[PDB]
Amino acid sequence: AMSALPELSKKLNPVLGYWDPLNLAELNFWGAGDDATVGFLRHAEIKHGRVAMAAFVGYCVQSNVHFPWAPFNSIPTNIAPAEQWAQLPEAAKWQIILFVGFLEVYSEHSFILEKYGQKHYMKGGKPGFFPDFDTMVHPVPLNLWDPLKAYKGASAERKADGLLKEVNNGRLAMIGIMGFCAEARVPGAVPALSNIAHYAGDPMAPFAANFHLPGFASXXXXXX
Amino acid sequence: SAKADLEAFAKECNPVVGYWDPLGLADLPLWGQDQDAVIGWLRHSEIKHGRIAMAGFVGYIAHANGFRFGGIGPQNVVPEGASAPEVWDSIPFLAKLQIIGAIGVLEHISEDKNFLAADGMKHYMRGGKPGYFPTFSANVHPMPLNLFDPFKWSKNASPEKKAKGLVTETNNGRLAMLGLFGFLSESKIPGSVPALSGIIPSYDGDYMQPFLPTGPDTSLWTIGNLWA
Amino acid sequence: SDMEGTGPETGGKVFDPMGLSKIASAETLAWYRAAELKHSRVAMAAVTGWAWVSSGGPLFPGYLSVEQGVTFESLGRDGYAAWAAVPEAGKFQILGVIGILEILSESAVKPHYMAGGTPGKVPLLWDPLGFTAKLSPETLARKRLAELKNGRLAMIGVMSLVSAHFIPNSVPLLPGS
Ligand code: CLA
Ligand code: CLA
Ligand SMILES: CC(=O)O[C@H]1CC(C)(C)C(=C=C/C(C)=C/C=C/C(C)=C/C=C/C=C(C)/C=C/C=C(\C)C(=O)C[C@@]23O[C@]2(C)C[C@@H](O)CC3(C)C)[C@](C)(O)C1
Ligand SMILES: CC(=O)O[C@H]1CC(C)(C)C(=C=C/C(C)=C/C=C/C(C)=C/C=C/C=C(C)/C=C/C=C(\C)C(=O)C[C@@]23O[C@]2(C)C[C@@H](O)CC3(C)C)[C@](C)(O)C1
Ligand SMILES: CC(=O)O[C@H]1CC(C)(C)C(=C=C/C(C)=C/C=C/C(C)=C/C=C/C=C(C)/C=C/C=C(\C)C(=O)C[C@@]23O[C@]2(C)C[C@@H](O)CC3(C)C)[C@](C)(O)C1
Ligand code: KC2
Ligand SMILES: CC1=C(C#C/C(C)=C/C=C/C(C)=C/C=C/C=C(C)/C=C/C=C(C)/C=C/[C@@]23O[C@]2(C)C[C@@H](O)CC3(C)C)C(C)(C)C[C@H](O)C1
């Protein structure tokens, strides 16, 4: 609801609560009521925070080291991590993006999410509900959220505190990852760091150069 | 009714001057359209002229000092230092067309009865508030935030504060009209106003012709520029 | 008046800035709808044909008057060049079939669209296979609205093509030939 967002923001920060200069809590840009917009915005914020904090940890890990499994060193020797991503095989990037899309279409589907006992976030579900992976006859050893258990005995208040902590952590980590990408692309952007370097090509581009693909890889005429 | 409101508004604009209508314009029937509609049209024209004059004054200062937004956009074609009349001389011709088209879109939204009845109010020539721009709850696709108050800084002010704001808006608009035309008069005839002599250079083109020096056809677009 | 046609993108209201109503009767509105629907369908066929011919398309395999030596490929991928390269006999056969069909459309429906009737509903030439023979009347109104919006877009499309052929570099995305 509209009143719940100010309470959640005050729980996240008591000094500054309900900070929306752009408002955005009344723009019904889906035409499905005010609650649907609030649920979409909360889910987008939480997803962006999770992805951004995981990307920050991954950039910190892969900016210095690699994984010794199967010739994963020539790709790690491609300067910046974004150039390493652009230097990965086409099948690798395709399967990674399709894997993430499979997780997204599993989470958003409001019949598997109904098997977990909740609903879609635009229809009253909680913001961020990647559910248990028990829907098909293919026995999975571990699920997505809490893979090696260790969270069954958690309390409701502890869950709410952890949710607020994760929201604030992603709130910081989105700006952190954006600053890392900006310093990678345009030097002198991040004034508190001068160590990260090398170009990223186009940072918002999954396919580049060696990616052949069925046409439409017109990397010519780029922008800033 | 409308004339008495003009008398009152002129009193709070300047109590010393008051109602100053030498050329009797608050009595001419323009299109055979009564008194109140003529008064509303005149007030709306005054307020629109004043707002455009204020925005043009600030934009003239920004262009003459040199205040380019950034890269890639239409500021790349305009040379570094050209005076304010020449920044509407080197932007692309399609950029001028789309700027004037968006201004016309805003005018049409301002007088569309469907946009105006969505807020419960009528035309300024039919008993409305002159100079009022409507909200955007009539578009077809939802607009993030309206034009008058883009953020919610307003809407908690008292109606008396709104009336004082309207009076200040009208007075500042008239003064900005005088200032902007002082700029334009110095740009054409030397020594028109005394303070700006030698500050603003001379211009040769026509100020009333939007597309007499047509801008270049430069297509500033990358990534998917399939339209040449 | 109310009619069909009105939906979103105008707010559920009739789009009519300059004139063209309050001078029209029921017969005039019926003719307006009939002309709009005929223009709609002709323009839809026109954009579909132009898009299939000039862009790509496997093209018709055959001869097209083997006696004259013309081929289907000899007309070229340009359109006004191809139509001028269609034989005069083929042009006349197309125009004659169209004229026969429309004379029978005028004379065959007994409530004429300007004497009652429904404008745009022509005898014959519609669904021979009965795909739309089981649709609900509420579904039929949606498809009529889709047809109207489609035809308006296709009219704009055909005139874009014609303007860019006669005036190069007009319709900026559309090429100069
Ligand atoms: C185009 C801009 C514009 C418009 C539409 C209006 C409209 C109006 N003004 Mg206003 N005004 C303006 C600019 C404008 N003003 C400027 C720049 C000033 C400061 C000098 C004022 C100062 C002012 C006062 C002090 C008062 C008004 C008032 C009024 C209202 C009725 C009086 C009237 O006859 O109208 C104004 C007359 C015209 C706009 C004349 C039309 C233009 C003519 C045809 C061209 C003349 C050009 C000519 C070269 C000028 C010679 C200047 C010099 C040699 C004398 C009306 C709503 C009265 C009021 O408060 O009601 C709300 C009032 O008492 N005006
Ligand atoms: C010649 C084709 C044609 C015809 C006969 C009609 C007829 C009609 N339209 Mg329609 N329309 C058309 C094309 C046409 N339309 C196109 C191409 C568009 C897309 C922009 C629309 C969009 C449209 C909307 C959004 C609505 C209508 C409505 C209507 C109905 C009432 C309007 C009226 O009284 O005017 C009928 C009389 C005429 C149209 C005569 C034409 C007048 C001059 C000669 C046209 C000149 C225009 C100019 C040359 C165009 C430039 C080229 C162009 C590609 C830009 C009526 C049945 C309304 C409706 O359904 O209400 C029930 C309604 O809401 N139309
Ligand atoms: C009780 C219970 O159930 O168990 C608990 C504990 C337990 C097991 C751990 C849990 C878990 C799971 C996990 C894996 C939790 C970990 C999550 C993770 C990985 C969280 C990363 C955040 C990354 C951040 C904040 C990055 C900030 C980044 C920042 C702030 C910046 O970069 C800013 C900055 O760059 C600028 C802009 C300029 C620079 O010059 C200066 C700096 C660098 C400052 C549970 C289940 O959740 C809860
Ligand atoms: C002898 C000789 O030559 O002398 C010369 C001297 C000199 C100086 C050269 C000359 C000149 C030029 C002049 C005088 C030019 C004047 C220009 C002028 C008078 C320009 C007004 C701008 C107003 C703006 C932009 C308003 C913004 C308004 C804004 C941004 C808002 O709406 C905000 C706000 O409303 C909300 C949303 C809610 C309110 O609660 C609070 C406020 C109000 C903040 C002359 C005329 O040539 C004469
Ligand atoms: C609601 C709606 O839809 O509208 C409704 C309402 C409304 C509008 C009232 C209606 C109406 C009335 C209408 C439309 C009336 C239209 C009247 C109209 C259109 C009147 C043209 C005159 C042109 C003349 C006399 C030109 C002479 C030109 C002459 C004599 C020349 O020698 C031309 C010249 O070139 C030569 C040959 C050689 C050169 O040397 C140049 C010159 C220029 C000298 C309708 C019809 O009821 C429809
Ligand atoms: C070029 C843009 C521009 C400029 C430079 C400008 C300057 C000032 C100044 C400073 C001199 C003041 C003090 C002031 C104050 C008010 N403005 Mg203005 N304003 C601009 C644009 C608009 C638009 C689009 C609208 C608007 C309005 C109001 C109302 C509400 C009155 C009410 O709610 O009763 C008040 C109090 C709204 C309206 O209602 O106008 C009748 C409306 O829609 N304004 N405005
Ligand atoms: C490349 C490609 C193609 C393509 C394409 C596409 C989609 C190109 C699209 C280009 C596009 C979409 C360009 C938009 C510009 C929008 C602007 C400038 C808006 C400014 C808006 C502004 C300045 C709004 C300002 C305000 O709103 C604010 C912020 C607050 C309000 O209170 C007040 C107003 C309203 C004034 C092909 C060829 C079609 C197919 C091919 O396969 C791939």
PDB file of C-alpha atoms in Angstrom, chain B residues 114 138-140 226-228, chain C residues 8-11 13 172-173:
ATOM      1  CA  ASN B 114     -10.457  16.465 -22.234  1.00  0.00           C
ATOM      2  CA  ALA B 138      -5.914  12.273 -19.907  1.00  0.00           C
ATOM      3  CA  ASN B 139      -2.963  11.225 -22.083  1.00  0.00           C
ATOM      4  CA  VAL B 140      -3.483   7.466 -22.954  1.00  0.00           C
ATOM      5  CA  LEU B 226      19.266   3.264 -40.173  1.00  0.00           C
ATOM      6  CA  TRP B 227      17.697   6.568 -41.295  1.00  0.00           C
ATOM      7  CA  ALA B 228      20.996   7.527 -42.982  1.00  0.00           C
TER       8      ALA B 228
ATOM      9  CA  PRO C   8      -8.314   4.683 -26.856  1.00  0.00           C
ATOM     10  CA  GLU C   9      -5.608   7.089 -28.183  1.00  0.00           C
ATOM     11  CA  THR C  10      -8.307   9.794 -28.202  1.00  0.00           C
ATOM     12  CA  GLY C  11      -9.843   8.951 -24.815  1.00  0.00           C
ATOM     13  CA  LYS C  13     -14.095  10.493 -27.813  1.00  0.00           C
ATOM     14  CA  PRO C 172      12.915   9.941 -43.140  1.00  0.00           C
ATOM     15  CA  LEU C 173      13.346   6.262 -42.274  1.00  0.00           C
TER      16      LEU C 173
END
